[model samples]
Target: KPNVTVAAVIEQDDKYLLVEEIPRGTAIKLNQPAGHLEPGESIIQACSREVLEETGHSFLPEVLTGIYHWTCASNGTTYLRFTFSGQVVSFDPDRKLDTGIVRAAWFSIDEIRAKQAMHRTPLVMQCIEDYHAGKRYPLDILQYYDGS
Candidate 1:
């Protein structure tokens, strides 16, 4: 199994940063500023880069959010997702869209939950509400030990 991908719950000015996306059809939806962990980068670095690329924002997390697991399958392929949460320092409205990205924007907690059915994936609002529910854990909690 290819175990990869990371996510972040970035908050600013009482609002969370969510990328509006079109996964399959004409209906646009919201999602966390998340992407796969790139080569030679920590999960936290991936979170910041993904957010910056997808949302054009600089995010700095004070605490470590829980590391989560997700499973998705399509066309005989399966992918796993790992998620994190944090805060945003700045965003650029003039930012060009990233590859595979349509448009990016911001949404309040209420706004995201109101459009739950339209999310790119269920993980969208779940990460937000999880953050709200104090679901974060220390980074040290995940002891990375290579079994090699």
Candidate 2:
């Protein structure tokens, strides 16, 4: 089974929000505010939760940017990622970030492209590129039923 994950592409003033993190046994790398889907939460909820945890910023998802399926050649793990374009509604400087996160920083497209080697996964740049290219879908594209 593919691991399902959620990520956000939050842009402000031509810069995008990204996190510097150290995945297990890997050097420090950059990625969007992202994480795996937890039980009992909707995909949108997972996206917002990941942003807050990774960046200490509250996020409001505006559009579904793209869904990506990628397999890591090293570990043979397949990932299905749901990416969203969003706005940062608020921030808490005192909030502690997630375990692997080093810091959250903003970068322009050129800056991001130049640091490609520091990226955690190819999907990181692909998500931002799709967002930059205006690839968007309505939020209703996902239907979450909690079995009410």
Candidate 3:
């Protein structure tokens, strides 16, 4: 079985979007706008929803950045993470973030790269590096419909 998750790589000007959250059994850490796959929703939909819920920002997931695999020592959880590179459509300055999220903020690549120790997972920086490398696949790689 696979534990699926999604993340949005949203950039503006020269900085990238990141969320500071206290993950279960862990101290405060920085990560991309990410979360697990929910029942009855497409991966694309999950990406959009997680970004909105965690960052109060609307994300348009335009391209698949990468697929990743990881097993965390602290959590012993295996994650099959699907990351997408995209643009920010809008932000709700008044909206509240998901529980445990300290805040959503922007950071330059140098700043983020310097804080690898603070990332929730290695995939956090790995994903960002891939995006910066201009690695992208068409969203058509994924398809969804009302029913089988």
Candidate 4:
């Protein structure tokens, strides 16, 4: 099966929330709170769960910012990424972050651009750019139903 991943683009007071994680085959890096979609979990659920685990913040996704399809040049792996832009309702300061996540940090657009080499994937900046471009879609656009 093709890989399906979810990401959250959340900004507060102009600085965007991002997680510093060490992805496989790379050194410690930065990325929007993102993860693969587990079987039986909806896209939104996966996004929300990833944000919480990676950033220790509860994400309230408001709009579907954009969908991205990319193939990794190194591994030849393709990913279908659902990107969401929304608010972070609350934070769990005492919660432990996911493995390989160094910490959650906020950064300005220019700061992120300067550290392009530290990004997990190109999608990191692409998603942020799309969010800043005012790209958004209704949540209803995604329909998930478990078969009865």
Candidate 5:
């Protein structure tokens, strides 16, 4: 089995950062900043780094939200993804987006619910909905140290 990759569902001021992409003539929606968990980095750290790269926002994750498993096959290749959720901080709109990112936009919970059919994956909205329900966990749910 391939190692898991983690992502986050970030929220702030009742708005979410959503990446809009047309993966195959259809909008493949993604959360504010989703990416794989890095080595020796805590889940919260990974979440913050990805959000900054993917949306130019510095994130402060205070929740575990939910853990999800997904298997996607693209171009004859299969892979897995992990998801996390948290709160949003100030974003620098002046910066450019990460490579492969189409564009970033903010959406309300209702708006996301209405666009489920177009999401990149089901986890897109699930994380946000979970956040709305006040779901989160202790930091130890994930752990990391510099080995110093």
Candidate 6:
């Protein structure tokens, strides 16, 4: 089964927000504020929640940047990632980040590209590149019908 995940490409002043986190059995890696889709949450909601949890910033997802399907060669795990382009509307400096997250930092596009070896997944940079390439889709492209 493919694991469903969401990520936000939050940019400001020519810098992108990324988190430094240590994944299971791995060294510190940089990634956009991202995480899995939780039960009972819409894709949009999951993206916003992940940004807040990982970066302590309130994210406003504006457009669907891209959707990616990738399989990790190391563990043979497949992933379906929904990536969004968005802005950070607010920040909570006193808020605690999610476990495994070391800290959230901003990096310019050049810096991000230079640190390729530090990225959690190739999709991290792929999403940013798509965003930079002006890939955008209306939020209505995703529809959620609650079955509660």
lDDT string for model 4 (7-75, tens) is: 999998889999888887558888999999998988998999999998889989999999999898988
lDDT by residue for model 5 (46-120), tens: 777888888777777666766765556554433455456666668788877776778888888889888878777
Query: Residue 125 in candidate 2 has what lDDT?
Result: 88
Judge candidate 4 at residue 77 and give its lDDT. Answer: 94
Clashes counted in candidate 1 amount to: 0
Instruction: Please report the TM-score between candidate 1 and the true structure.
Output: 0.80
Task: State each model's C-alpha RMSD to the native.
Answer: 3.2, 0.8, 1.3, 1.1, 2.9, 1.0
Any runs in candidate 4 off by more than 4 Å, and if so which?
Answer: none
Name the weakest run of 10 consecutive residues (lDDT summed) in model 6.
23-32
RMSD of candidate 5 to the true fold? Answer: 2.9
- The top-ranked prediction according to TM-score is 2
Better of 4 and 6 by lDDT: 6
lDDT of each: 0.72, 0.94, 0.91, 0.92, 0.70, 0.93
The best candidate by lDDT is: 2
On TM-score, the stronger of 1 and 4 is 4
Question: What is the alpha-carbon lDDT of model 6 when measured against the actual structure?
Answer: 0.93
Candidate 3 vs candidate 5, TM-score winner: 3
Query: Residue 7's C-alpha lDDT in candidate 2?
Result: 93
lDDT of 6 by residue, 1-148 (tens): 7999999998889899999999886699999999999899899999999999999999998999999999999889999999998889999899889999999999999999999998998998899988989999998999997796
Off by over 4 Å in 2: none
| Residue 103 displacement (Å), model 2 | 0.2
